[PDB]
Amino acid sequence: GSGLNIKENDLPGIGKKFEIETRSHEKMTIIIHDDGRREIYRFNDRDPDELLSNISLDDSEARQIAAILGG
Amino acid sequence: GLNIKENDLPGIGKKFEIETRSHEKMTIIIHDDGRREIYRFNDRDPDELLSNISLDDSEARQIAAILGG
């Protein structure tokens, strides 16, 4: 329902996957690869089968975007 | 490479336009009241919005924690 929901899954030997549902009921998946790569996926609010957008960031880029996003 | 342009929106907040090394583009608006709005655009078409998301201050900080480790 409401509130922020974050589901974390280990991808053995690969990295970590975070599935996020926001208070606005929007959905995003973040994959953090062991090598540093971050992948963000944005899906249709009501259709998990439809990818709206995706972006790949290296570790340094993800950190800089994080700095902007957070505080 | 990575390019970031920061502008003030007077009386509203701040705007960051970001171009990545993968040549993907995003705009982040940070409102004074704490709202974050994120806009994703077509790499070659600035007038086509791919996706957008609204986060409160709490959410933005949590997601930032995940992204930046």
mmCIF file of N, CA and C in Angstrom:
data_model
loop_
_atom_site.group_PDB
_atom_site.id
_atom_site.type_symbol
_atom_site.label_atom_id
_atom_site.label_comp_id
_atom_site.label_asym_id
_atom_site.label_seq_id
_atom_site.Cartn_x
_atom_site.Cartn_y
_atom_site.Cartn_z
ATOM 1 N N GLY A 1 0.815 -1.201 0.000
ATOM 2 C CA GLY A 1 0.000 0.000 0.000
ATOM 3 C C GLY A 1 0.851 1.255 0.000
ATOM 4 N N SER A 2 0.557 2.172 0.917
ATOM 5 C CA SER A 2 1.358 3.384 1.059
ATOM 6 C C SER A 2 2.701 3.063 1.714
ATOM 7 N N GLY A 3 3.420 4.098 2.131
ATOM 8 C CA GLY A 3 4.754 3.918 2.673
ATOM 9 C C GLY A 3 5.751 3.507 1.600
ATOM 10 N N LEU A 4 7.036 3.514 1.951
ATOM 11 C CA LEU A 4 8.102 3.091 1.050
ATOM 12 C C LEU A 4 8.399 1.626 1.285
ATOM 13 N N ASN A 5 8.345 0.849 0.216
ATOM 14 C CA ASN A 5 8.605 -0.580 0.300
ATOM 15 C C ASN A 5 9.842 -0.915 -0.512
ATOM 16 N N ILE A 6 10.820 -1.562 0.119
ATOM 17 C CA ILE A 6 12.039 -1.976 -0.570
ATOM 18 C C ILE A 6 12.263 -3.471 -0.345
ATOM 19 N N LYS A 7 12.274 -4.230 -1.436
ATOM 20 C CA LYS A 7 12.556 -5.658 -1.412
ATOM 21 C C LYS A 7 13.963 -5.900 -1.949
ATOM 22 N N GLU A 8 14.803 -6.488 -1.119
ATOM 23 C CA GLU A 8 16.172 -6.795 -1.502
ATOM 24 C C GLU A 8 16.341 -8.275 -1.811
ATOM 25 N N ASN A 9 17.020 -8.538 -2.922
ATOM 26 C CA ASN A 9 17.318 -9.897 -3.314
ATOM 27 C C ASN A 9 18.783 -10.041 -3.683
ATOM 28 N N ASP A 10 19.421 -11.091 -3.182
ATOM 29 C CA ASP A 10 20.783 -11.401 -3.588
ATOM 30 C C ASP A 10 20.748 -12.119 -4.924
ATOM 31 N N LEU A 11 21.594 -11.675 -5.843
ATOM 32 C CA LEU A 11 21.799 -12.384 -7.088
ATOM 33 C C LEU A 11 23.142 -13.073 -6.901
ATOM 34 N N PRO A 12 23.123 -14.366 -6.554
ATOM 35 C CA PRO A 12 24.373 -15.041 -6.196
ATOM 36 C C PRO A 12 25.454 -14.919 -7.264
ATOM 37 N N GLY A 13 26.600 -14.366 -6.879
ATOM 38 C CA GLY A 13 27.748 -14.276 -7.762
ATOM 39 C C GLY A 13 27.684 -13.078 -8.690
ATOM 40 N N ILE A 14 26.601 -12.317 -8.605
ATOM 41 C CA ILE A 14 26.353 -11.200 -9.521
ATOM 42 C C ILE A 14 26.228 -9.858 -8.808
ATOM 43 N N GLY A 15 25.356 -9.797 -7.807
ATOM 44 C CA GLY A 15 25.190 -8.583 -7.034
ATOM 45 C C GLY A 15 23.895 -8.569 -6.257
ATOM 46 N N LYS A 16 23.294 -7.393 -6.133
ATOM 47 C CA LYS A 16 22.085 -7.228 -5.350
ATOM 48 C C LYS A 16 21.040 -6.517 -6.176
ATOM 49 N N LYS A 17 19.793 -6.920 -5.989
ATOM 50 C CA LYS A 17 18.667 -6.307 -6.658
ATOM 51 C C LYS A 17 17.731 -5.709 -5.619
ATOM 52 N N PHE A 18 17.356 -4.457 -5.838
ATOM 53 C CA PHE A 18 16.399 -3.759 -4.982
ATOM 54 C C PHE A 18 15.165 -3.386 -5.782
ATOM 55 N N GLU A 19 14.008 -3.880 -5.355
ATOM 56 C CA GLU A 19 12.750 -3.513 -5.987
ATOM 57 C C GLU A 19 12.041 -2.541 -5.056
ATOM 58 N N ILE A 20 11.760 -1.359 -5.574
ATOM 59 C CA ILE A 20 11.294 -0.240 -4.778
ATOM 60 C C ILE A 20 9.901 0.172 -5.240
ATOM 61 N N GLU A 21 8.979 0.296 -4.287
ATOM 62 C CA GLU A 21 7.660 0.877 -4.537
ATOM 63 C C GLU A 21 7.493 2.115 -3.677
ATOM 64 N N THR A 22 7.294 3.256 -4.321
ATOM 65 C CA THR A 22 7.304 4.515 -3.607
ATOM 66 C C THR A 22 5.934 4.836 -3.036
ATOM 67 N N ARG A 23 5.866 5.920 -2.270
ATOM 68 C CA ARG A 23 4.608 6.362 -1.695
ATOM 69 C C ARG A 23 3.670 6.878 -2.784
ATOM 70 N N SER A 24 4.256 7.305 -3.904
ATOM 71 C CA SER A 24 3.472 7.719 -5.064
ATOM 72 C C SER A 24 2.994 6.520 -5.890
ATOM 73 N N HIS A 25 3.286 5.319 -5.394
ATOM 74 C CA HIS A 25 2.922 4.067 -6.053
ATOM 75 C C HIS A 25 3.660 3.875 -7.371
ATOM 76 N N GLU A 26 4.863 4.434 -7.453
ATOM 77 C CA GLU A 26 5.712 4.258 -8.627
ATOM 78 C C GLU A 26 6.765 3.176 -8.367
ATOM 79 N N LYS A 27 7.303 2.588 -9.431
ATOM 80 C CA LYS A 27 8.156 1.407 -9.277
ATOM 81 C C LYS A 27 9.503 1.517 -9.955
ATOM 82 N N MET A 28 10.548 1.137 -9.232
ATOM 83 C CA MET A 28 11.882 1.157 -9.799
ATOM 84 C C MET A 28 12.687 -0.021 -9.270
ATOM 85 N N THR A 29 13.530 -0.575 -10.129
ATOM 86 C CA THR A 29 14.424 -1.647 -9.738
ATOM 87 C C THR A 29 15.865 -1.164 -9.904
ATOM 88 N N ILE A 30 16.691 -1.385 -8.886
ATOM 89 C CA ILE A 30 18.101 -1.012 -8.957
ATOM 90 C C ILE A 30 18.924 -2.275 -8.780
ATOM 91 N N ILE A 31 19.789 -2.551 -9.751
ATOM 92 C CA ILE A 31 20.734 -3.652 -9.638
ATOM 93 C C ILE A 31 22.107 -3.083 -9.324
ATOM 94 N N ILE A 32 22.713 -3.568 -8.250
ATOM 95 C CA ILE A 32 24.066 -3.172 -7.913
ATOM 96 C C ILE A 32 24.994 -4.344 -8.160
ATOM 97 N N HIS A 33 25.734 -4.269 -9.259
ATOM 98 C CA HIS A 33 26.620 -5.359 -9.664
ATOM 99 C C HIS A 33 27.881 -5.327 -8.815
ATOM 100 N N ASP A 34 28.452 -6.499 -8.557
ATOM 101 C CA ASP A 34 29.647 -6.576 -7.733
ATOM 102 C C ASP A 34 30.819 -5.781 -8.304
ATOM 103 N N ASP A 35 30.841 -5.604 -9.623
ATOM 104 C CA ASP A 35 31.961 -4.918 -10.273
ATOM 105 C C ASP A 35 31.864 -3.393 -10.192
ATOM 106 N N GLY A 36 30.706 -2.892 -9.781
ATOM 107 C CA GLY A 36 30.526 -1.461 -9.619
ATOM 108 C C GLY A 36 29.349 -0.897 -10.382
ATOM 109 N N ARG A 37 29.025 -1.519 -11.512
ATOM 110 C CA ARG A 37 27.889 -1.107 -12.327
ATOM 111 C C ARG A 37 26.602 -0.998 -11.514
ATOM 112 N N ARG A 38 25.847 0.074 -11.741
ATOM 113 C CA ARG A 38 24.473 0.170 -11.280
ATOM 114 C C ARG A 38 23.566 0.177 -12.502
ATOM 115 N N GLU A 39 22.458 -0.555 -12.432
ATOM 116 C CA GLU A 39 21.449 -0.460 -13.478
ATOM 117 C C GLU A 39 20.148 -0.070 -12.820
ATOM 118 N N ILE A 40 19.502 0.962 -13.347
ATOM 119 C CA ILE A 40 18.184 1.373 -12.875
ATOM 120 C C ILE A 40 17.169 1.025 -13.958
ATOM 121 N N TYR A 41 16.069 0.404 -13.552
ATOM 122 C CA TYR A 41 14.969 0.097 -14.460
ATOM 123 C C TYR A 41 13.711 0.750 -13.927
ATOM 124 N N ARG A 42 12.929 1.332 -14.818
ATOM 125 C CA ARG A 42 11.653 1.967 -14.475
ATOM 126 C C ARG A 42 10.563 1.265 -15.257
ATOM 127 N N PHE A 43 9.540 0.790 -14.561
ATOM 128 C CA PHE A 43 8.484 0.027 -15.203
ATOM 129 C C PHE A 43 7.178 0.779 -15.120
ATOM 130 N N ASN A 44 6.253 0.431 -16.010
ATOM 131 C CA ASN A 44 4.907 0.981 -15.985
ATOM 132 C C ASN A 44 4.271 0.801 -14.608
ATOM 133 N N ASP A 45 3.700 1.889 -14.087
ATOM 134 C CA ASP A 45 3.086 1.923 -12.758
ATOM 135 C C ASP A 45 2.217 0.696 -12.484
ATOM 136 N N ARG A 46 1.481 0.261 -13.502
ATOM 137 C CA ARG A 46 0.544 -0.846 -13.347
ATOM 138 C C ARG A 46 0.858 -2.069 -14.212
ATOM 139 N N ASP A 47 1.975 -2.031 -14.935
ATOM 140 C CA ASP A 47 2.374 -3.167 -15.769
ATOM 141 C C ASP A 47 3.863 -3.481 -15.653
ATOM 142 N N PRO A 48 4.202 -4.502 -14.854
ATOM 143 C CA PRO A 48 5.591 -4.932 -14.640
ATOM 144 C C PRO A 48 6.278 -5.426 -15.919
ATOM 145 N N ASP A 49 5.494 -5.827 -16.916
ATOM 146 C CA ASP A 49 6.041 -6.348 -18.168
ATOM 147 C C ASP A 49 6.522 -5.261 -19.123
ATOM 148 N N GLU A 50 6.229 -4.004 -18.802
ATOM 149 C CA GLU A 50 6.580 -2.896 -19.685
ATOM 150 C C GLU A 50 7.669 -2.004 -19.101
ATOM 151 N N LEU A 51 8.829 -1.998 -19.753
ATOM 152 C CA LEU A 51 9.939 -1.132 -19.372
ATOM 153 C C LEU A 51 9.758 0.266 -19.951
ATOM 154 N N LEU A 52 9.752 1.274 -19.078
ATOM 155 C CA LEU A 52 9.653 2.668 -19.488
ATOM 156 C C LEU A 52 11.024 3.224 -19.820
ATOM 157 N N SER A 53 11.974 2.965 -18.935
ATOM 158 C CA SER A 53 13.322 3.476 -19.102
ATOM 159 C C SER A 53 14.331 2.625 -18.344
ATOM 160 N N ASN A 54 15.575 2.686 -18.794
ATOM 161 C CA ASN A 54 16.669 2.061 -18.078
ATOM 162 C C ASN A 54 17.961 2.838 -18.259
ATOM 163 N N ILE A 55 18.794 2.840 -17.229
ATOM 164 C CA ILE A 55 20.040 3.587 -17.307
ATOM 165 C C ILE A 55 21.144 2.799 -16.620
ATOM 166 N N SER A 56 22.318 2.797 -17.233
ATOM 167 C CA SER A 56 23.466 2.156 -16.631
ATOM 168 C C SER A 56 24.451 3.225 -16.175
ATOM 169 N N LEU A 57 24.916 3.077 -14.940
ATOM 170 C CA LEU A 57 25.871 3.996 -14.351
ATOM 171 C C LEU A 57 27.081 3.222 -13.860
ATOM 172 N N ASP A 58 28.268 3.805 -13.966
ATOM 173 C CA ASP A 58 29.420 3.230 -13.279
ATOM 174 C C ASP A 58 29.381 3.661 -11.822
ATOM 175 N N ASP A 59 30.294 3.134 -11.017
ATOM 176 C CA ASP A 59 30.273 3.353 -9.577
ATOM 177 C C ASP A 59 30.415 4.831 -9.227
ATOM 178 N N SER A 60 31.333 5.510 -9.899
ATOM 179 C CA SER A 60 31.560 6.921 -9.633
ATOM 180 C C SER A 60 30.335 7.760 -9.990
ATOM 181 N N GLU A 61 29.707 7.436 -11.112
ATOM 182 C CA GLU A 61 28.516 8.149 -11.548
ATOM 183 C C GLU A 61 27.364 7.938 -10.570
ATOM 184 N N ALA A 62 27.183 6.700 -10.123
ATOM 185 C CA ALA A 62 26.082 6.401 -9.204
ATOM 186 C C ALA A 62 26.265 7.180 -7.907
ATOM 187 N N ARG A 63 27.508 7.285 -7.450
ATOM 188 C CA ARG A 63 27.806 8.013 -6.222
ATOM 189 C C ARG A 63 27.524 9.510 -6.370
ATOM 190 N N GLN A 64 27.858 10.072 -7.524
ATOM 191 C CA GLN A 64 27.607 11.492 -7.747
ATOM 192 C C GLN A 64 26.114 11.808 -7.867
ATOM 193 N N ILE A 65 25.370 10.921 -8.515
ATOM 194 C CA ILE A 65 23.929 11.102 -8.624
ATOM 195 C C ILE A 65 23.295 10.945 -7.252
ATOM 196 N N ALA A 66 23.795 9.987 -6.480
ATOM 197 C CA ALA A 66 23.326 9.786 -5.109
ATOM 198 C C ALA A 66 23.526 11.040 -4.260
ATOM 199 N N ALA A 67 24.662 11.713 -4.450
ATOM 200 C CA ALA A 67 24.980 12.909 -3.689
ATOM 201 C C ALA A 67 23.965 13.996 -4.000
ATOM 202 N N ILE A 68 23.599 14.105 -5.273
ATOM 203 C CA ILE A 68 22.597 15.076 -5.680
ATOM 204 C C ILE A 68 21.234 14.703 -5.108
ATOM 205 N N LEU A 69 20.842 13.449 -5.306
ATOM 206 C CA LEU A 69 19.540 12.969 -4.851
ATOM 207 C C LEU A 69 19.350 13.115 -3.348
ATOM 208 N N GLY A 70 20.340 12.664 -2.589
ATOM 209 C CA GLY A 70 20.245 12.657 -1.140
ATOM 210 C C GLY A 70 20.841 13.882 -0.483
ATOM 211 N N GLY A 71 19.978 14.733 0.062
ATOM 212 C CA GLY A 71 20.413 15.962 0.698
ATOM 213 C C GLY A 71 21.118 16.885 -0.275
ATOM 214 N N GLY B 1 31.639 11.885 -21.440
ATOM 215 C CA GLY B 1 31.822 11.715 -20.010
ATOM 216 C C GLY B 1 30.630 12.186 -19.196
ATOM 217 N N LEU B 2 30.783 12.190 -17.875
ATOM 218 C CA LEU B 2 29.724 12.662 -16.990
ATOM 219 C C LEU B 2 29.707 14.194 -16.919
ATOM 220 N N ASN B 3 28.535 14.770 -17.153
ATOM 221 C CA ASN B 3 28.355 16.221 -17.152
ATOM 222 C C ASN B 3 27.133 16.568 -16.331
ATOM 223 N N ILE B 4 27.260 17.548 -15.437
ATOM 224 C CA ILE B 4 26.171 17.984 -14.561
ATOM 225 C C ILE B 4 26.078 19.502 -14.571
ATOM 226 N N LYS B 5 24.896 20.009 -14.890
ATOM 227 C CA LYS B 5 24.609 21.433 -14.909
ATOM 228 C C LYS B 5 23.597 21.732 -13.819
ATOM 229 N N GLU B 6 23.968 22.607 -12.899
ATOM 230 C CA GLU B 6 23.112 23.005 -11.785
ATOM 231 C C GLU B 6 22.589 24.433 -11.995
ATOM 232 N N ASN B 7 21.281 24.625 -11.815
ATOM 233 C CA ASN B 7 20.639 25.940 -11.913
ATOM 234 C C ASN B 7 19.706 26.169 -10.722
ATOM 235 N N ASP B 8 19.556 27.414 -10.299
ATOM 236 C CA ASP B 8 18.558 27.744 -9.281
ATOM 237 C C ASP B 8 17.237 28.072 -9.943
ATOM 238 N N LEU B 9 16.166 27.548 -9.356
ATOM 239 C CA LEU B 9 14.821 27.936 -9.723
ATOM 240 C C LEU B 9 14.366 28.876 -8.612
ATOM 241 N N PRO B 10 14.407 30.185 -8.874
ATOM 242 C CA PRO B 10 14.192 31.144 -7.790
ATOM 243 C C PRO B 10 12.877 30.914 -7.056
ATOM 244 N N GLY B 11 12.984 30.733 -5.746
ATOM 245 C CA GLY B 11 11.818 30.597 -4.897
ATOM 246 C C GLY B 11 11.189 29.219 -4.977
ATOM 247 N N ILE B 12 11.816 28.306 -5.713
ATOM 248 C CA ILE B 12 11.269 26.966 -5.948
ATOM 249 C C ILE B 12 12.233 25.851 -5.523
ATOM 250 N N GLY B 13 13.478 25.922 -5.985
ATOM 251 C CA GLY B 13 14.469 24.963 -5.559
ATOM 252 C C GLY B 13 15.639 24.956 -6.516
ATOM 253 N N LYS B 14 16.125 23.769 -6.830
ATOM 254 C CA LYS B 14 17.288 23.603 -7.693
ATOM 255 C C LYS B 14 17.040 22.570 -8.785
ATOM 256 N N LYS B 15 17.640 22.798 -9.947
ATOM 257 C CA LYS B 15 17.564 21.874 -11.063
ATOM 258 C C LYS B 15 18.955 21.365 -11.450
ATOM 259 N N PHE B 16 19.072 20.050 -11.611
ATOM 260 C CA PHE B 16 20.297 19.392 -12.081
ATOM 261 C C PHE B 16 20.016 18.655 -13.378
ATOM 262 N N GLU B 17 20.747 19.001 -14.425
ATOM 263 C CA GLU B 17 20.633 18.290 -15.682
ATOM 264 C C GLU B 17 21.887 17.450 -15.824
ATOM 265 N N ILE B 18 21.698 16.146 -15.987
ATOM 266 C CA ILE B 18 22.781 15.182 -15.940
ATOM 267 C C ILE B 18 22.901 14.424 -17.254
ATOM 268 N N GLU B 19 24.113 14.386 -17.812
ATOM 269 C CA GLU B 19 24.418 13.547 -18.973
ATOM 270 C C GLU B 19 25.458 12.522 -18.562
ATOM 271 N N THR B 20 25.178 11.244 -18.814
ATOM 272 C CA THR B 20 26.038 10.169 -18.333
ATOM 273 C C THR B 20 27.039 9.719 -19.394
ATOM 274 N N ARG B 21 27.986 8.874 -18.987
ATOM 275 C CA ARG B 21 28.989 8.332 -19.897
ATOM 276 C C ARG B 21 28.380 7.340 -20.885
ATOM 277 N N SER B 22 27.221 6.791 -20.529
ATOM 278 C CA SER B 22 26.465 5.932 -21.437
ATOM 279 C C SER B 22 25.621 6.779 -22.384
ATOM 280 N N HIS B 23 25.754 8.097 -22.250
ATOM 281 C CA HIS B 23 25.037 9.068 -23.074
ATOM 282 C C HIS B 23 23.539 8.982 -22.837
ATOM 283 N N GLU B 24 23.178 8.813 -21.572
ATOM 284 C CA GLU B 24 21.786 8.872 -21.157
ATOM 285 C C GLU B 24 21.575 10.139 -20.340
ATOM 286 N N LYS B 25 20.339 10.633 -20.307
ATOM 287 C CA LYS B 25 20.069 11.952 -19.751
ATOM 288 C C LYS B 25 18.987 11.940 -18.687
ATOM 289 N N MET B 26 19.223 12.689 -17.623
ATOM 290 C CA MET B 26 18.211 12.835 -16.584
ATOM 291 C C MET B 26 18.170 14.240 -15.997
ATOM 292 N N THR B 27 16.995 14.650 -15.527
ATOM 293 C CA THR B 27 16.838 15.949 -14.886
ATOM 294 C C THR B 27 16.307 15.703 -13.492
ATOM 295 N N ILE B 28 16.926 16.326 -12.501
ATOM 296 C CA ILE B 28 16.480 16.150 -11.121
ATOM 297 C C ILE B 28 16.127 17.518 -10.588
ATOM 298 N N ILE B 29 14.885 17.665 -10.125
ATOM 299 C CA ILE B 29 14.466 18.916 -9.491
ATOM 300 C C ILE B 29 14.398 18.662 -7.997
ATOM 301 N N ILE B 30 15.099 19.467 -7.208
ATOM 302 C CA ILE B 30 15.011 19.359 -5.762
ATOM 303 C C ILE B 30 14.274 20.568 -5.242
ATOM 304 N N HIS B 31 13.048 20.344 -4.786
ATOM 305 C CA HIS B 31 12.196 21.428 -4.323
ATOM 306 C C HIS B 31 12.612 21.846 -2.921
ATOM 307 N N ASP B 32 12.435 23.124 -2.599
ATOM 308 C CA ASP B 32 12.742 23.608 -1.257
ATOM 309 C C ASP B 32 12.007 22.858 -0.142
ATOM 310 N N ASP B 33 10.789 22.408 -0.425
ATOM 311 C CA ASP B 33 9.989 21.700 0.572
ATOM 312 C C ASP B 33 10.455 20.253 0.738
ATOM 313 N N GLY B 34 11.391 19.841 -0.111
ATOM 314 C CA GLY B 34 12.003 18.529 0.016
ATOM 315 C C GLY B 34 11.643 17.527 -1.059
ATOM 316 N N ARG B 35 10.563 17.774 -1.794
ATOM 317 C CA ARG B 35 10.219 16.926 -2.933
ATOM 318 C C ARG B 35 11.358 16.809 -3.953
ATOM 319 N N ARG B 36 11.609 15.592 -4.437
ATOM 320 C CA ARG B 36 12.476 15.356 -5.584
ATOM 321 C C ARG B 36 11.639 14.901 -6.770
ATOM 322 N N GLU B 37 11.883 15.484 -7.934
ATOM 323 C CA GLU B 37 11.270 14.997 -9.154
ATOM 324 C C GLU B 37 12.367 14.622 -10.121
ATOM 325 N N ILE B 38 12.288 13.410 -10.659
ATOM 326 C CA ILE B 38 13.285 12.885 -11.595
ATOM 327 C C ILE B 38 12.651 12.652 -12.964
ATOM 328 N N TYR B 39 13.276 13.190 -14.013
ATOM 329 C CA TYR B 39 12.771 13.070 -15.373
ATOM 330 C C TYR B 39 13.831 12.392 -16.231
ATOM 331 N N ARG B 40 13.408 11.397 -17.007
ATOM 332 C CA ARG B 40 14.284 10.663 -17.919
ATOM 333 C C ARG B 40 13.912 10.951 -19.361
ATOM 334 N N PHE B 41 14.888 11.371 -20.154
ATOM 335 C CA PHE B 41 14.614 11.745 -21.526
ATOM 336 C C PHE B 41 15.327 10.875 -22.527
ATOM 337 N N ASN B 42 14.745 10.822 -23.720
ATOM 338 C CA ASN B 42 15.343 10.154 -24.856
ATOM 339 C C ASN B 42 16.717 10.757 -25.108
ATOM 340 N N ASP B 43 17.711 9.903 -25.331
ATOM 341 C CA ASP B 43 19.085 10.357 -25.516
ATOM 342 C C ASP B 43 19.235 11.358 -26.660
ATOM 343 N N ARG B 44 18.417 11.201 -27.696
ATOM 344 C CA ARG B 44 18.511 12.057 -28.873
ATOM 345 C C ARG B 44 17.317 12.999 -29.051
ATOM 346 N N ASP B 45 16.302 12.862 -28.202
ATOM 347 C CA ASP B 45 15.111 13.708 -28.298
ATOM 348 C C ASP B 45 14.711 14.279 -26.938
ATOM 349 N N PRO B 46 15.059 15.552 -26.689
ATOM 350 C CA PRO B 46 14.855 16.218 -25.397
ATOM 351 C C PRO B 46 13.382 16.475 -25.100
ATOM 352 N N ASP B 47 12.541 16.384 -26.122
ATOM 353 C CA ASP B 47 11.123 16.673 -25.960
ATOM 354 C C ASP B 47 10.321 15.401 -25.700
ATOM 355 N N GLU B 48 11.007 14.261 -25.687
ATOM 356 C CA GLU B 48 10.347 13.000 -25.383
ATOM 357 C C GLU B 48 10.713 12.531 -23.983
ATOM 358 N N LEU B 49 9.706 12.463 -23.123
ATOM 359 C CA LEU B 49 9.884 12.009 -21.759
ATOM 360 C C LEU B 49 9.696 10.501 -21.719
ATOM 361 N N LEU B 50 10.704 9.802 -21.222
ATOM 362 C CA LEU B 50 10.649 8.351 -21.117
ATOM 363 C C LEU B 50 9.931 7.929 -19.844
ATOM 364 N N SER B 51 10.266 8.601 -18.753
ATOM 365 C CA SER B 51 9.738 8.246 -17.449
ATOM 366 C C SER B 51 9.975 9.378 -16.466
ATOM 367 N N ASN B 52 9.194 9.375 -15.394
ATOM 368 C CA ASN B 52 9.393 10.311 -14.310
ATOM 369 C C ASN B 52 8.955 9.696 -12.994
ATOM 370 N N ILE B 53 9.525 10.190 -11.907
ATOM 371 C CA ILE B 53 9.171 9.690 -10.589
ATOM 372 C C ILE B 53 9.255 10.796 -9.547
ATOM 373 N N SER B 54 8.334 10.737 -8.592
ATOM 374 C CA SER B 54 8.255 11.699 -7.514
ATOM 375 C C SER B 54 8.646 11.002 -6.220
ATOM 376 N N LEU B 55 9.570 11.610 -5.489
ATOM 377 C CA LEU B 55 10.047 11.086 -4.214
ATOM 378 C C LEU B 55 9.978 12.176 -3.153
ATOM 379 N N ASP B 56 9.569 11.833 -1.933
ATOM 380 C CA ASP B 56 9.713 12.788 -0.837
ATOM 381 C C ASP B 56 11.161 12.793 -0.321
ATOM 382 N N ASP B 57 11.454 13.677 0.623
ATOM 383 C CA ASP B 57 12.823 13.849 1.090
ATOM 384 C C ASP B 57 13.360 12.565 1.711
ATOM 385 N N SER B 58 12.534 11.935 2.544
ATOM 386 C CA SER B 58 12.858 10.644 3.138
ATOM 387 C C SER B 58 13.219 9.606 2.083
ATOM 388 N N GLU B 59 12.360 9.460 1.079
ATOM 389 C CA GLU B 59 12.559 8.465 0.037
ATOM 390 C C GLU B 59 13.817 8.738 -0.766
ATOM 391 N N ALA B 60 14.033 10.006 -1.095
ATOM 392 C CA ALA B 60 15.192 10.376 -1.893
ATOM 393 C C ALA B 60 16.468 9.970 -1.171
ATOM 394 N N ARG B 61 16.506 10.190 0.135
ATOM 395 C CA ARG B 61 17.700 9.858 0.898
ATOM 396 C C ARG B 61 17.914 8.350 0.977
ATOM 397 N N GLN B 62 16.834 7.594 1.124
ATOM 398 C CA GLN B 62 16.965 6.140 1.165
ATOM 399 C C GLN B 62 17.446 5.569 -0.167
ATOM 400 N N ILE B 63 16.878 6.052 -1.263
ATOM 401 C CA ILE B 63 17.269 5.581 -2.577
ATOM 402 C C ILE B 63 18.709 6.016 -2.876
ATOM 403 N N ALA B 64 19.077 7.213 -2.428
ATOM 404 C CA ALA B 64 20.455 7.673 -2.589
ATOM 405 C C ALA B 64 21.416 6.736 -1.864
ATOM 406 N N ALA B 65 21.005 6.245 -0.695
ATOM 407 C CA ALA B 65 21.843 5.337 0.078
ATOM 408 C C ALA B 65 22.105 4.038 -0.685
ATOM 409 N N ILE B 66 21.078 3.534 -1.361
ATOM 410 C CA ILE B 66 21.214 2.329 -2.175
ATOM 411 C C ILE B 66 22.137 2.556 -3.373
ATOM 412 N N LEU B 67 21.911 3.650 -4.085
ATOM 413 C CA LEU B 67 22.685 3.954 -5.281
ATOM 414 C C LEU B 67 24.160 4.161 -4.999
ATOM 415 N N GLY B 68 24.459 4.918 -3.951
ATOM 416 C CA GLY B 68 25.823 5.334 -3.696
ATOM 417 C C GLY B 68 26.566 4.406 -2.765
ATOM 418 N N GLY B 69 25.877 3.378 -2.286
ATOM 419 C CA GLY B 69 26.453 2.487 -1.300
ATOM 420 C C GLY B 69 26.765 3.251 -0.028
#
